[PDB]
């Protein structure tokens, strides 16, 4: 992945549209963190519905501007009353429930 | 520490000589990683005998 962005510096691209799983997205972000392309000048677009699921705090103040899509608006009270019911659940009973946010795959599962 | 390097961008320095404990050195490195001043153009000098002890 070092040689990947070095191949991107053969044309010196600033405009990267990632389309990966959020685990693989966070891998690529850590590669960008390793080489410092999160600085001002670059721009990123995360092509999934779990834009809030990815780690934004580690690249919030690097300099590049990251765009994305969140299908589940957390400011909605229909969502927020579910979130207040979400985090209060036990991790030993419901793993992944005692969290501030939720994956969209879990949300559409609840919507299903 | 965000505002620290923003104050260093008031004169836009590329030449930082750190003199801290290696725990506090690794804190400042993670701040540089957070803001991306580890890119080409900057230069750093770690003023201790444990240069290999820090996360390079």
From Swiss-Prot, chain A:
PTM summary: Palmitoylated. Depalmitoylated upon L-glutamate stimulation. Ubiquitinated by RNF167, leading to its degradation.
Places the protein is found: Cell membrane; Postsynaptic cell membrane; Postsynaptic density membrane
Superkingdom: Eukaryota
Residues bearing attached sugar chains per UniProt: 65
Factors inducing expression: Down-regulated in the pyramidal cell layer of CA1 in the hippocampus by global ischemia.
Tissue expression profile of the protein: Detected in forebrain. Detected in dendrites of neuronal cells. Expressed in the pyramidal cell layers of CA1 and CA3 and in the granule cell layer of the dentate gyrus.
Free-text domain note: The M4 transmembrane segment mediates tetramerization and is required for cell surface expression.
Note: The postsynaptic actions of L-glutamate are mediated by a variety of receptors that are named according to their selective agonists. This receptor binds AMPA (quisqualate) > L-glutamate > kainate.
Function text: Ionotropic glutamate receptor that functions as a ligand-gated cation channel, gated by L-glutamate and glutamatergic agonists such as alpha-amino-3-hydroxy-5-methyl-4-isoxazolepropionic acid (AMPA), quisqualic acid, and kainic acid. L-glutamate acts as an excitatory neurotransmitter at many synapses in the central nervous system and plays an important role in fast excitatory synaptic transmission.
Family: Belongs to the glutamate-gated ion channel (TC 1.A.10.1) family. GRIA2 subfamily.
Assembly information from the UniProt record: Homotetramer or heterotetramer of pore-forming glutamate receptor subunits. Tetramers may be formed by the dimerization of dimers. May interact with MPP4. Forms a ternary complex with GRIP1 and CSPG4. Interacts with ATAD1 in an ATP-dependent manner. ATAD1-catalyzed ATP hydrolysis disrupts binding to ATAD1 and to GRIP1 and leads to AMPAR complex disassembly. Interacts with GRIP2. Interacts with GRIP1. Interacts with NSF via its C-terminus. Interacts with CACNG2, PICK1 and GRIP2. Interacts with GRIA1 and SYNDIG1. Part of a complex containing GRIA2, NSF and NAPA and/or NAPB.
Protein's name according to its UniProt entry: Glutamate receptor 2
Protein's organism: Rattus norvegicus
């Amino acid at each position: 992945y070092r040689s990947l962005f070095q191949d991107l510096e053969l044309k010196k691209e600033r405009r990267v549209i990632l389309d990966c799983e959020r685990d693989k997205v966070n891998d690529i972000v850590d590669q960008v963190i390793t080489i410092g392309k999160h600085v001002k000048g670059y721009h990123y677009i995360i092509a999934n519905l779990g834009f809030t699921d990815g780690d934004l705090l580690k690249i919030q103040f690097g300099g590049a501007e990251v765009s994305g899509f969140q299908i589940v608006d957390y400011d909605d009270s229909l969502v927020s009353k579910f979130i207040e019911r979400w985090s209060t659940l036990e991790e030993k009973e419901y793993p992944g429930a005692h969290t501030a946010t939720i994956k969209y795959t879990s949300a559409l599962t609840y919507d299903a």
